[PDB]
């Protein structure tokens, strides 16, 4: 790996500089290098890894949606034929997106998840595994689409089972997991009633636990609760 000669601490320092400069491809390469040193990641380091790849794949997903929309219109009735270029370029961006998801899933499998024993780290990584299989499912159309969808579901479900046993209902990791699993049900699994039920139960159980929190923790939890409410308003 091209980061093999750089100190672990120097990689983490440069990931933070790259975030400040909005250089997210560099940030992701620095954090991949840090993971490949073989040591477990701290809470702060896990969040640097997630921020880096979320921004890279987020740009790819937005571009893919623009190109897919143009392609679908070109296949409508009455549209002038323009050749293979739209499909080719959508395929190019799709292949690059799939490569980024495969890179993240590979880091989780070698060997972040198997060394993660505490609930906060294990739930964080299983949620990430669900998220990157969900991004693969957004572009999947072939014989493997059902297995990709089940891999996302299975990862989210194991994370949910641990979070319900080991974390309070206001924990921000537990809340963000439930938010994203609810969107999986609505957008990917064609299960809008399951999506609405999960968001509502998660919101109500967090509301009843807010009284236990400090002012700073209350702010952290209510920010994610507002996203659950915004989705419920969109869906009902």
């Amino acid at each position: 790996g091209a980061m093999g000669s750089m100190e672990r601490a120097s990689l983490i320092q440069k990931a933070k500089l790259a975030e400040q400069a909005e250089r997210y491809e560099d940030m992701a390469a620095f954090m991949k290098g840090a993971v490949e040193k073989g040591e477990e990641l701290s809470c702060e380091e896990r969040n640097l890894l997630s921020v880096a790849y979320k921004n890279v794949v987020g740009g790819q997903r937005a571009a893919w949606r623009v190109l897919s929309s143009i392609e679908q219109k070109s296949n409508e009735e009455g549209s002038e034929e323009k050749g293979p270029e739209v499909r080719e370029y959508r395929e190019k961006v799709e292949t690059e997106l799939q490569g980024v998801c495969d890179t993240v899933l590979g880091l989780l499998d070698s060997h972040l998840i198997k060394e993660a024993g505490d609930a906060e780290s294990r739930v964080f990584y299983l949620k990430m595994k669900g998220d990157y299989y969900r991004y693969l499912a957004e572009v999947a159309t072939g014989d493997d689409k059902k297995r990709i969808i089940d891999s996302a579901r299975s990862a989210y479900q194991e994370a949910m089972d641990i979070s319900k046993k080991e974390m309070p209902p206001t924990n921000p990791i537990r809340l963000g997991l439930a938010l994203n699993f609810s969107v999986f049900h609505y957008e990917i699994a064609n299960s809008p009633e399951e999506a609405i039920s999960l968001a509502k139960t998660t919101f109500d159980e967090a509301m009843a636990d807010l009284h236990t929190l400090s002012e700073d923790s209350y702010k952290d939890s209510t920010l994610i609760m507002q996203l659950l409410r915004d989705n419920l308003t969109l869906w009902t």
Partner: peptide, 9 residues
């Protein structure tokens, strides 16, 4: 429109 998923920390 698209629903919200978990934002940056």
């Amino acid at each position: 429109d698209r629903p919200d998923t978990e934002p940056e920390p």
